[PDB]
Write a protein that binds this ligand. Structure first.
Ligand SMILES: [Cu+2]
Ligand SMILES: [Cu+2]
Ligand SMILES: [Cu+2]
Ligand SMILES: [Cu+2]
Lengths: 151, 151
């Protein structure tokens, strides 16, 4: 309802803890992700909270308005399109995002859905091939977790 | 949501997959859990979907109506009180429960909360002692997972 949390795990070294808090009429996303390669990594909400086949069973990006993939500042984007997180030379990425389209309740609620951090940078729907318009060319899912209600 | 799933994991060998499906004004819970010691094991929905400290961070039983702990057929029970699952000699528990109090939507929604399989049998609030009234004397949490939206 007001606060949520996600613990990111995968088959590699990438781990992290993401916190979500409804503040006013928006949602603030914070936390950190370690064990990444330096550089940008796509960071999205995928539709299902199903981890029966690791991160693969989370499905595509959460997209209740049926739009094409984009960057978080675009009109045309998926609700789950949170852009990229940037890791330092030590593999650490600090997440500090304010997003208008996600919610913690109602139609846009991401509770019970999956947060994924990807292998490569998300090209924000501007790569030029069909895959850019679905995933940003963000590639494999390095770690993920189901978003749960927190105290 | 009309369907949900949860993958149970812990620090030991207990693991499992639980499916949830709304049917009528009930939730049908099916699945299997392996790696258990033969006999009954308490099986409850805990309040928070927070795995930051393993299963310990899931909090107490989901109890929105502030009742004492009971068995699933009791009027005085927590919403998250699903009774016991039973493992056979090979440590395999088959899950098949129909419950009318838990839900996949609205106020009693368990999406984003934690399913827990316990060390001991749940005494269903009839243990004679005080601990019975809170947890059923089910003991340790062997495995847990956050309940997620499924396809
Ligand atoms: Cu993605
Ligand atoms: Cu997208
Ligand atoms: Cu319990
Ligand atoms: Cu209880």
């Amino acid at each position: 309802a007001t606060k949520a949390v996600c613990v990111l795990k995968g088959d590699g070294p990438v781990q992290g803890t993401i916190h979500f808090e409804a503040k006013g009429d928006t949602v603030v996303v914070t936390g950190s992700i370690t064990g990444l390669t330096e550089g940008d990594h796509g960071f999205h909400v995928h539709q299902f909270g199903d981890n029966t086949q690791g991160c693969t069973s989370a499905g595509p990006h959460f997209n209740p308005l049926s739009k094409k993939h984009g960057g978080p500042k675009d009109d045309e984007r998926h609700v789950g399109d949170l852009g990229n997180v940037t890791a330092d030379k030590n593999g650490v990425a600090i997440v500090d995002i304010v997003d208008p389209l996600i919610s913690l309740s109602g139609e846009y609620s991401i509770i019970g859905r999956t947060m994924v951090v990807h292998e490569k940078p998300d090209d924000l729907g501007r790569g030029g091939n069909e895959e850019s318009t679905s995933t940003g060319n963000a590639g494999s899912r390095l770690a993920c977790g189901v978003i749960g209600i927190a105290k």
